[PDB]
Amino acid sequence: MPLAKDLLHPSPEEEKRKHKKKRLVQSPNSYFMDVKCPGCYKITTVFSHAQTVVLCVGCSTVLCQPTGGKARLTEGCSFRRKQH
Amino acid sequence: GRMHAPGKGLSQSALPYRRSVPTWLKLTSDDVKEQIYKLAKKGLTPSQIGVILRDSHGVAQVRFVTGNKILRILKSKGLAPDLPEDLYHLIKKAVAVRKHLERNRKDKDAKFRLILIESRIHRLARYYKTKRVLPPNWKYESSTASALVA
Amino acid sequence: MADIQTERAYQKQPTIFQNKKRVLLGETGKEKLPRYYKNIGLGFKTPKEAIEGTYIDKKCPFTGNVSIRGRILSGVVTKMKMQRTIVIRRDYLHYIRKYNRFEKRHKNMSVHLSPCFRDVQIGDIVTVGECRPLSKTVRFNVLKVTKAAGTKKQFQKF
Amino acid sequence: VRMNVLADALKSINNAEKRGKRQVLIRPCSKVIVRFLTVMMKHGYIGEFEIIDDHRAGKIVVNLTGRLNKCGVISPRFDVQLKDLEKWQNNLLPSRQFGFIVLTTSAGIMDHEEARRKHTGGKILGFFF
Amino acid sequence: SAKIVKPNGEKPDEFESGISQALLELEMNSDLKAQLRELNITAAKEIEVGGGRKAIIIFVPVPQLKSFQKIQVRLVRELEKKFSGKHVVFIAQRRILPKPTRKSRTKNKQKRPRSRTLTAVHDAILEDLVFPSEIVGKRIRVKLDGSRLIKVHLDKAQQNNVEHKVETFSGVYKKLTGKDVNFEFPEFQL
RNA sequence: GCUGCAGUUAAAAAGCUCGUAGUUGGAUCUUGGAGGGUGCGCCGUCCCCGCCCUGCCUCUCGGCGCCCCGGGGCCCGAAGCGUUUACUUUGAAAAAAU
C-alpha cells in the first residue's frame, strides 16, 4: 500500500488472483465445457464444478464425479470450453 | 455474519454480469420450462431442479433463459407445496433432532441445538406469515410438526 | 339484518311518522318505513348502508341525532369487542429536547360505530370525528373506514 | 450489519487521506453518497470520482488531492430548524468562515451556504473541511 | 406505403417512406422474405455525426424486438448498403412513466413497472444502441465541472459491426437523453 | 457528561447463548437579463428574485367547448382534492406584567 495503484484499472493478473467476491467489479471464476466419449458422437455441455453425476445423452456412462470443487472428468475424455 | 454461530465465512455464488447470453446456449424457454415442470413432477425441489439443470444440462441460471425464478415457474404450473422449502427442511431437521433427543435424553448438546433450529424456524415463519405465504395464525408445533413434514 | 326492534322498546327515528292506510297492493304500502338521513359534512360520503338500512342507531352520524364538530382524527382499530363501539389506537410522537429524540407514544380512543359500517375489523385504519358526549367514555364517531386489504400480509379480494 | 452506507464511504475516504492515499474504492454507494461526493467535489475537497457498475449496488473510485482535513457524517439525521443550522456549523466547523455542514432538505442535498441562500432547511447529513 | 408500416399513430413519410420501400426491395427474395414481413416500424428519425455523415434511427413496438434481433445484422447490413452514407440502427420505443409526487397529485395511479422507469429505459437505450456485443460493464466519471460521463464497456467479439459506429452512438444517445457516453474495450479473465 | 464521560489493569462488560418487547435496518423508481435594499463621485460595487445561456382530472357540478339523433355522448375561475404521514417552509391564532 504505497500510495500507488489505479484502483479503477487494476491489473488483469492480480485481479485474476483475487477472491471472486473481491474482484474490482465482481465476477465468477467458473466455466462450461463440451464433453466427448468416442462411442457417441454428440456432445454434452457440463459445468466446471458439478455436484451431480453427470451422465451422457444415452449411454449410462459417467462424465465426471463431483468434489470439493471442480468436477473430476473421467479418464478418456476431451473438452473444448467454451463461449464468450 | 452467520446467525446462530460465530462463523464468519464468506462464500457464495458469484453471479455473472454479462446481461445476456449464454449465446453458445441454443435451446429455448419452451425447452427448459418443460424440463423444470417434468423434474418437479418427479418430486424434485427448486434448489434441486436448479442444480441438476445446471450441471447435467445447460442452464446457467433458469432465470436468464426464462424471465422467471424456478419457484415461480412451479407455482404457475401448479406445483408449489404447502410450505416453502427452506421452512420444510428446517422443520424436517428439527424433527430428526427431536426424534434423536427422545431416544437420548442425556445429550445436552442436542437440546441446545434443537432450540437453535427451532428459533430459526419460528422467525422464518414469522417472516412468511408477515408476507401472506403462510396463513396468519400459522405456527410450528412439535406435536403436529412431525405429522406435517411427512 | 336480524330483527332490530329486538329490544323491549320500539326502536324508531323520532318525528318520522307513519301512516300506513287502507286500499290495495303494498298493502298498506311497500316501504312501510320512511327513513331520514343526512350527510355529515366535511365531504364524508354517507354510505349507502345508512340509507338502505333498517337499523336505528340514534348514535349514527348519518341516521341519528348527533352532529360532528370538532377534531377529526384517524387511528387504527385495536378492538371491536363492544357492540356498536370500537377502540382505536392513536400513535403520536413525543419530542424530548432536554436531549432530543422523542419516543413513540399512544392513546386509545373509544368511538361509537354505526352499523352502517361493517367489516369494522381490527387492523382497519379508520377516520372518526368529534361529537357530543355519547357515553361517559365516547367522544367520537366512525365517519369513514379507510380499509385496506393491503398491508398484503394476506390477499384480500374484490 | 449495515444501518447506513454513507458513514462507511466517508470513513474510507478519511483513512485514505490520512494514509497519504490519492484514490479510494468505496462500496457500495447510493444516490446519497453520489450527492455528498458531489457537494464535496464542487468545493474542491475531492478530485473526480467514478461509479463502477457491478450488477449489485455500485462501487465508487474517488481521486483525492489533499485539501481534506475531515469529512464526517452525522447520525442520526437530526432535524434542523434554520436556527439550529447556525448552532450546528459552530459546533462542528473550524472557523466561521469555511467548511461546510451538508444537510438534506426538501429542496435537495446541499451545503448549508446554499441552504441559507435558498432559504430552506431540513435534516443534517454530515460535513467537511 | 405510408399507411402500413410508418404508422403507430401518425402516417408520415419521407424517410419512413424510403426505408419502407427499401424493406420491400429486400422483401422480394427468399427466406429474405416471410421472416421479415411480420416486422413493422413506428417511425424513423435522422440525426447526424459531427463531421457530417448522418445516422438513421428506427423505432420498434418492443414486442417485436426479439424478431428484429433475429435478423438485425443481416438487415442492418442491407440498409447500410442500399441507404449508404448513414448509420442504421434499431431502438425500441419504450414508454417511461413519471415518478409520482405527492401532489403529482396522486390518485394512486396503478403502480407502474421498473420496466417503466426513466433510468431503466435509458439503460435499455444503451443496450439497444450497440448490438450483439454486450455491455460488459459501466462506470460513471464525475468531471471537475459538475459534469458526468458514462463509460460503457464493450465485449470484444464480433464488435467490428459496431466499431466504426461508436461516435454516432454517442451522438444519438445525447439526442435522446442529453447525457454523454464513451466506449471502451476489456480484458479476458484468466 | 444531548452537545460532551468512563468501564484490559484505576470505581465499572452479566460465565455463555437463545429470545419477545424496544431500539435499529442494503442498493434501486424525475433528467447574461433586468425588479428591490446602502456605499462610493450620470456612472457603477455588493445581496435578493422569476430566467435563460415538473399536480392530474373534471371541462356531486359547472360549462371553456367538440362531434350525434326533448333524448345523447364527449369534454381563467370553479370544481373535482388530495395516497398516507413525519419532516421542514411560509402564514394566521398567538394575555399583560416579565
From Swiss-Prot, chain B:
Quaternary structure and interacting proteins, as annotated: Component of the small ribosomal subunit. Part of the small subunit (SSU) processome, composed of more than 70 proteins and the RNA chaperone small nucleolar RNA (snoRNA) U3.
Protein's UniProt name: Small ribosomal subunit protein uS15
Role, per record: Component of the small ribosomal subunit. The ribosome is a large ribonucleoprotein complex responsible for the synthesis of proteins in the cell. Part of the small subunit (SSU) processome, first precursor of the small eukaryotic ribosomal subunit. During the assembly of the SSU processome in the nucleolus, many ribosome biogenesis factors, an RNA chaperone and ribosomal proteins associate with the nascent pre-rRNA and work in concert to generate RNA folding, modifications, rearrangements and cleavage as well as targeted degradation of pre-ribosomal RNA by the RNA exosome.
Location(s), subcellular: Cytoplasm; Nucleus, Nucleolus
Modified residues (N6-acetyllysine): K26
Domain of life where this protein originates: Eukaryota
Protein's GO biological process: translation
Lineage: Eukaryota, Metazoa, Chordata, Craniata, Vertebrata
Cellular component terms (Gene Ontology): cytosolic ribosome; cytosolic small ribosomal subunit; nucleolus
Matches recorded under CDD domains: Ribosomal_S15p_S13e (cd00353)
Gene designation per UniProt: RPS13
From Swiss-Prot, chain C:
Modified residues (Omega-N-methylarginine): R69
Functional note: Component of the small ribosomal subunit. The ribosome is a large ribonucleoprotein complex responsible for the synthesis of proteins in the cell. Part of the small subunit (SSU) processome, first precursor of the small eukaryotic ribosomal subunit. During the assembly of the SSU processome in the nucleolus, many ribosome biogenesis factors, an RNA chaperone and ribosomal proteins associate with the nascent pre-rRNA and work in concert to generate RNA folding, modifications, rearrangements and cleavage as well as targeted degradation of pre-ribosomal RNA by the RNA exosome.
Keywords attached to this entry: Acetylation, Citrullination, Cytoplasm, Lipoprotein, Methylation, Nucleus, Palmitate, Phosphoprotein, Ribonucleoprotein, Ribosomal protein, RNA-binding, rRNA-binding
Family as reported in the entry's similarity comment: Belongs to the universal ribosomal protein uS17 family.
Positions of modified residues (N-acetylalanine): A2
Keyword Repressor assigned: no
CC per GO annotation: cytosolic ribosome; cytosolic small ribosomal subunit; nucleolus
InterPro entries from the UniProt entry: NA-bd_OB-fold, Ribosomal_uS17, Ribosomal_uS17_arc/euk, Ribosomal_uS17_CS, Ribosomal_uS17_N
Lipidation (S-palmitoyl cysteine): C60
Entry protein name: Small ribosomal subunit protein uS17
One of the protein's GO biological processes: translation
Gene3D superfamilies: 2.40.50.1000
Positions bearing N6-acetyllysine: K38, K45, K58
Gene Ontology terms, MF aspect: rRNA binding; structural constituent of ribosome
Modified residues (Citrulline): R22
Phosphoserine found at: S67, S110
Pfam families xref list: Ribosomal_S17, Ribosomal_S17_N
Subcellular location field: Cytoplasm; Nucleus, Nucleolus
Post-translational modification: Citrullinated by PADI4.
Main location: cytoplasm
The keyword NAD belongs to this UniProt entry's keyword annotation: no
Gene name as annotated: RPS11
UniProtKB/Swiss-Prot annotation, chain D:
Compartments (UniProt record): Cytoplasm; Nucleus, Nucleolus
Subunit details: Component of the 40S ribosomal subunit. Part of the small subunit (SSU) processome, composed of more than 70 proteins and the RNA chaperone small nucleolar RNA (snoRNA) U3.
Organism: Oryctolagus cuniculus
Family classification: Belongs to the universal ribosomal protein uS8 family.
Signal peptide range in chain numbering: none
Task of the protein: Component of the small ribosomal subunit. Part of the small subunit (SSU) processome, first precursor of the small eukaryotic ribosomal subunit. During the assembly of the SSU processome in the nucleolus, many ribosome biogenesis factors, an RNA chaperone and ribosomal proteins associate with the nascent pre-rRNA and work in concert to generate RNA folding, modifications, rearrangements and cleavage as well as targeted degradation of pre-ribosomal RNA by the RNA exosome. Required for proper erythropoiesis.
Matching Gene3D superfamilies: 3.30.1370.30, 3.30.1490.10
GO MF annotation list: structural constituent of ribosome
An individual GO BP term: translation
Domain of life from the UniProt record: Eukaryota
Record protein name field: Small ribosomal subunit protein uS8
Keyword Nucleus: yes
Residues modified as N6-succinyllysine: K87
Single GO cellular component term: nucleolus
Keywords for the protein's UniProt record, in alphabetical order: Cytoplasm, Nucleus, Ribonucleoprotein, Ribosomal protein
Keyword Transferase belongs to the record: no
Any Pfam family the entry gives: Ribosomal_S8
Main location as per UniProt: cytoplasm
Curated annotation (Swiss-Prot), chain E:
GO biological process: ribosomal small subunit biogenesis; rRNA processing; translation
Pfam families assigned: Ribosomal_S7e
Location in the cell: Cytoplasm, Cytoskeleton, Microtubule organizing center, Centrosome; Cytoplasm; Nucleus, Nucleolus
PTM statement from Swiss-Prot or TrEMBL: Phosphorylated by NEK6. Ubiquitinated. Deubiquitinated by DESI2, leading to its stabilization.
MF GO annotations: structural constituent of ribosome
Position(s), cross-link Glycyl lysine isopeptide (Lys-Gly) (interchain with G-Cter in SUMO2): K66, K70
Modification N6-acetyllysine occurs at: K70
InterPro entries reported for this sequence: Ribosomal_eS7, Ribosomal_eS7_CS
Similarity remark: Belongs to the eukaryotic ribosomal protein eS7 family.
Function: Component of the small ribosomal subunit. The ribosome is a large ribonucleoprotein complex responsible for the synthesis of proteins in the cell. Required for rRNA maturation. Part of the small subunit (SSU) processome, first precursor of the small eukaryotic ribosomal subunit.
Subunit structure: Component of the small ribosomal subunit. Part of the small subunit (SSU) processome, composed of more than 70 proteins and the RNA chaperone small nucleolar RNA (snoRNA) U3. Binds IPO9 with high affinity. Interacts with NEK6. Interacts with DESI2. Interacts with IPO5, IPO7 and KPNB1; these interactions may be involved in RPS7 nuclear import for the assembly of ribosomal subunits.
The name this protein goes by in its record: Small ribosomal subunit protein eS7
Annotated organism of origin: Oryctolagus cuniculus
Gene giving rise to this polypeptide: RPS7
